[PDB]
């Protein structure tokens, strides 16, 4: 997998060498094709994982993501052509390159055989992200948000560093292939009960768990649209990908060491879903929607039943695409409105007829409408959770009712009701804004036709 | 300085560490340490400002008593073994003295009070020498005697330094002292692995030298001893803003940059030796060091502090360039990580 | 560590014994990296000194890309030796002190009862 | 090119990684042994050199 | 030692006088000369860990 990567690196030379006026089209046009080369990995006629080479591999779980990581770079670069079009021609070429490095790094992290290669690349992605959030962040508080995003991930990260070096001494190689075909069975000691927490905690932090998710609402609030898309679509899912490949070892402990997180997540799912119900900042509501719909995932990567896992793989890819779509349209309202407040800007369909159709489809993806991969995902996690304990439906049942309420409230108070009297007149929709959306949903429609590709390792 | 004097002094400041390293007769190692003490004091008071005399008089007393303690260890050994050099048989207290003494000259842990203060009153230039070409000498003496020193003490001085360095740095706003504090911290990691794998001490030093030397020549390019002063870097010289950003995050352990390797292999070696107690606590507060590094990042790069009109005047005039060493030592430092296996 | 080994060359860079090892291919990815590492140093310099970044010092750019690379071949040539000594040393010991490193024979799975923790 | 290429490539990748793993562990055991046993080329700490012991005949007799 | 510029250069400015049994002025042997020899020709080729 060096075509999904080397051609990517070369994007950096192109963003720099290219003309200031033509820099945007060379980069966006080329990475669209970079995504097309990424689609070749999907050709898996057989079960055997495709081990491209010693360090680089792609198995069913990584492949559905590498393609998404390559896909969003085009979109990210199309959603940030407006803001970042007021810059000095060298601030742009920095932002474009920053976005380019994220997927170079993220493509490799999702396509990495050695778990510590994951760690080095895993924690590197913070550098590009922190720059995108802090350097271009509009609000006074991004310095703070950046600190929260760096420390919560970093304090979790050093325990994983110690744990992975620890298993290398215990087993003798951090190669995901071998670690899988070798006998690593923890022994339920008090210490192992700590190892397990060391490995999972760093992944559980960037996958916002109810206890440590305050970093994500603060980060996406002041982050520029491209950073918020990256955090929701690819960055948070780095934590999920890690939990799937790391729990191959630590096989016995999670049977009983998971209860704490599972309950934290399912109760967390309800409270995070509910506070979405009365949050005035739209970007705030989407972020907590992201916490709740990701709290379902940590509760399926821990129950560990075949269906959970691919419920997880289905939902992660699906929610990634949906969340961005929501964060992308939130930005289009923010740029014309100039405020994140949900109460202002009422009645837009009256003035932006189509963006409202995109808003409606994004919300229906947000809630579980049935001919969507989003529902298949939740339906499956729901099933397994029920298997874990029939009572789980109650808590995963209060979340579904709440999820319907906030998803439609975003449509009802942003895209319906009487028009706002006279905010700065709202200029019509650009074709870029609409495509950036179409590019998010057309793939959501196509993937829902053949869900098999994003089903995970389990199935 | 009459250029002749400059030569004699500089030769001594350079013959000082070199005799230490080359000789085996400890005595000759002691005088190497003594010559470094004598040579550095003249340069320290070059401005001869009231702050300076204070600096040198502290540096000298701290250095002198430690030098006398190191000599006492050699004198005691001479009686416990006729040899003029530490051996397997050496009484444990004899070696511990040498650790404390040498940890004072290097300024590690509970003897970390002199360094921040002398780093504050000396010029940026002599600051570098006082931080990096004066650590080579004592460390050489320790690295030579590693097989014999105590694993317990070193670790305590190691951990303490890491903490003191980190905590001290958080509050400081003067750059010279932020660096002094960082050096205390890095010096700590170095002395942690000495008992186990000296060869890594020599890596955690070089990398510190290849990181600090560019960082200081950056601070002086604009001769800013204040963060507020380095924050207006964007107006005085915009290009160094990019690398100053990476070098400081490299000084802390963040993974893509070269700075991770020293911490990573030291942790790998300590876990190989089973100190998974000690290594863990060190790595954790090591993370405190990055917080103050990033706070500076914020002021200098990620956010643009307001500047003064008189600055437009300094822009007009051609900026005297930074020596080539900056570049070669900025890149070899910010990004060599892809070449770690050979380095170790 | 590896110092104190018999025959150690007290101050030599790469003992002739390292002749026996294969020479590093000049295009070894690493030496090529050092090259790029170098070009960047050059470009960076131009930038910090405020010169046209790429179109200036085309002589220097060469000195850099060619100094770093030169250094590489002769360094890697050594680091390669050091690693090679490590095996010579390591493998030898495994034999000279055989009992301590005994070739164990594992049993096939048919015999090994591995515990099954039911997920349920 | 086929199912054959990846299956055979993956087995080659596993053999390199399996052999690297066994050796890395054996290093740690050899390095534990030579440190304590001091009977191997690594960890051979120095003692004075007999090349300076003066074996000459001293005027002072009896020694 | 740390940097053996002495062995390399072949010079011996610091080794000739590190133990009592080394050449004494006017060939006047120092005290204890009967043992240090016996204790360093023993520990020669045997590293410290096994000179102890």
């Amino acid at each position: 997998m060096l075509k999904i990567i080397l051609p990517s690196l070369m994007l950096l030379p192109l963003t720099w060498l290219s003309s200031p006026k033509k820099t945007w089209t060379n980069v966006t046009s080329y990475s669209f094709l970079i995504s097309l080369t990424s689609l070749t990995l999907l050709w898996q006629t057989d079960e055997n994982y495709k081990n491209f080479s010693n360090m680089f591999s792609s198995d069913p779980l990584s492949t559905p993501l590498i393609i998404l990581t390559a896909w969003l770079l085009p979109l990210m670069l199309m959603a940030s052509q407006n803001h970042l079009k007021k810059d000095n021609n060298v601030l742009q070429k920095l932002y474009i390159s920053m976005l380019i490095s994220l997927q170079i790094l993220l493509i490799m992290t999702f396509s990495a055989t050695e778990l510590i290669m994951f760690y080095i690349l895993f924690e590197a992605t913070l550098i590009p992200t922190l720059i995108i959030i802090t350097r271009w962040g509009n609000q006074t508080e991004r310095l703070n948000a950046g600190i929260y995003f760096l420390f919560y991930t970093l304090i979790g990260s050093i325990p994983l560093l110690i744990a992975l070096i620890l298993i290398q001494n215990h087993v003798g190689t951090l190669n995901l292939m071998i670690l899988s075909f070798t006998t690593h069975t923890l022994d339920a000691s008090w210490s192992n009960n700590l190892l397990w927490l060391a490995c999972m905690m760093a992944f559980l932090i960037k996958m916002p768990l109810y206890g440590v998710h305050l970093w994500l609402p603060k980060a996406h609030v002041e982050a520029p649209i491209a950073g918020s898309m990256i955090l929701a679509a690819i960055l948070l899912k780095l934590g999920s990908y890690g939990m799937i490949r790391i729990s191959i070892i630590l096989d016995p402990l999670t049977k009983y060491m998971a209860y704490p997180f599972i309950l934290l997540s399912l109760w967390g799912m309800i409270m995070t879903s509910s506070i979405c119900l009365r949050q005035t900042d739209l970007k705030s509501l989407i972020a907590y929607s992201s916490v709740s719909h990701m709290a379902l995932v940590i509760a399926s990567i821990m129950i560990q039943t075949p269906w959970s896992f691919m419920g997880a793989t289905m939902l992660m890819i699906a929610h990634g695409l949906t969340s961005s779509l929501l964060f992308c349209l939130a930005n289009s309202n923010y740029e014309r409105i100039h405020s994140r407040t949900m109460i202002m800007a009422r009645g837009l369909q009256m003035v932006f007829p189509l963006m409202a159709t995109w808003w409606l489809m994004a919300s229906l993806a947000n809630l579980a409408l049935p001919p969507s991969i989003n529902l298949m995902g939740e339906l499956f996690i729901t099933m397994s959770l029920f298997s874990w304990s029939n009572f789980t439906i109650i808590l995963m049942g209060i979340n579904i009712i709440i999820t319907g309420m906030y998803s439609m409230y975003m449509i009802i108070t942003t895209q319906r009701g009487k028009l706002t009297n006279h905010m700065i007149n709202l200029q019509p929709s650009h074709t870029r804004e609409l495509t950036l959306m179409a590019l998010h949903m057309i793939p959501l429609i196509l993937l829902t036709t053949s869900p098999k590709l994003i089903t995970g390792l389990t199935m | 300085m009459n250029p002749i004097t400059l030569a004699i002094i500089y030769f001594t400041i350079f013959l000082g560490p070199v005799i230490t390293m080359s000789s085996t007769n400890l005595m000759l190692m002691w005088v190497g340490l003594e010559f470094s003490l004598l040579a550095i004091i003249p340069m320290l008071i070059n401005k001869k400002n009231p702050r300076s005399t204070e600096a040198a008089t502290k540096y000298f007393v701290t250095q002198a008593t430690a030098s006398m303690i190191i000599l006492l260890a050699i004198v005691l050994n001479y009686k416990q073994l006729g040899t003029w050099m530490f051996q397997q048989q050496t009484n444990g207290l004899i070696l511990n003295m040498t650790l404390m003494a040498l940890s004072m000259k290097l300024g590690l842990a509970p003897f970390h009070f002199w360094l921040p203060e002398v780093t504050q009153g000396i010029p940026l230039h002599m600051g570098l020498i006082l931080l990096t070409w004066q650590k080579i000498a004592p460390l050489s003496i320790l690295i030579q005697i590693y097989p014999l020193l105590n694993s317990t003490i070193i670790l305590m001085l190691a951990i303490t330094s890491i903490f003191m360095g980190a905590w001290g740095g958080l509050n400081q706003t003067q750059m010279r002292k932020i660096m002094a504090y960082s050096s205390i911290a890095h010096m700590g990691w170095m002395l942690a692995i000495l008992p186990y794998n000296p060869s890594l001490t020599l890596l955690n030093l070089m990398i510190y030298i290849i990181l600090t030397a560019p960082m200081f020549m950056a601070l002086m390019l604009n001769n800013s001893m204040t963060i507020n002063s380095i924050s207006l870097l964007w107006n005085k010289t915009p290009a160094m803003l990019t690398m100053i950003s990476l070098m400081l995050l490299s000084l802390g352990g963040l993974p893509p940059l070269t700075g991770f390797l020293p911490k990573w292999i030291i942790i790998t070696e300590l876990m190989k030796n089973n100190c998974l107690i000690m290594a863990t606590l060190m790595a954790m507060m090591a993370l405190l060091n990055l917080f103050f590094y990033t706070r500076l990042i914020y002021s200098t790069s990620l956010t643009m502090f307001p500047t003064n009109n008189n600055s437009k005047m300094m822009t007009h005039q051609t900026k005297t360039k930074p020596n080539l060493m900056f570049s070669t030592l900025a890149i070899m430092s910010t990004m060599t990580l892809p070449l770690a296996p050979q380095l170790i | 560590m590896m110092n104190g080994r018999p025959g150690h060359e007290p101050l030599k860079f790469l003992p002739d014994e390292a002749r026996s090892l294969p020479p590093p291919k000049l295009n070894d990815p690493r030496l090529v990296y050092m090259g790029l590492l170098g070009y960047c140093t050059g470009l960076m310099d131009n930038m910090l000194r405020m010169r046209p970044v790429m179109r200036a010092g085309l002589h220097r750019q060469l000195l850099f890309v060619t100094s770093f690379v030169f250094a590489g071949y002769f360094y890697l040539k050594r680091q390669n030796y050091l690693y090679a000594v490590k095996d010579h040393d390591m493998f030898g010991y495994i034999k000279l002190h055989p009992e301590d490193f005994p070739e164990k024979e594992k049993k096939t799975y048919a015999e090994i009862l591995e515990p099954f923790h039911p997920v349920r | 090119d086929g199912p054959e290429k990846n299956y055979e490539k993956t087995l080659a990748i596993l053999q390199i990684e399996s052999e690297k793993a066994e050796l890395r562990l054996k290093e740690q055991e050899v390095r534990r042994l030579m440190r304590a046993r001091g009977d191997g080329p690594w960890y051979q700490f120095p003692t004075p050199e007999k090349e300076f012991i003066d074996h000459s005949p001293k005027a002072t007799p009896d020694n | 030692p740390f940097l053996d510029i002495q062995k390399k250069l072949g010079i011996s400015l610091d080794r000739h006088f590190m133990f009592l049994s080394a050449e004494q002025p006017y060939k006047n042997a120092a005290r204890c000369h009967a043992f240090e020899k016996e204790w360093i020709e023993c520990a020669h080729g045997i590293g410290g860990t096994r000179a102890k």
Binding site: - | - | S20, Y83, Y93 | - | A43, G47
Partner: peptide, 27 residues
């Protein structure tokens, strides 16, 4: 009596086995 000199590792160097075996470096 005198002690026995440590034995001597013997042979010729051969390129290291599988290369630097550092974390994930095909080298």
């Amino acid at each position: 009596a005198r002690p026995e000199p440590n034995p001597v590792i013997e042979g010729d160097l051969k390129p290291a086995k599988h290369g630097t075996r550092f974390f994930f470096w095909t080298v």
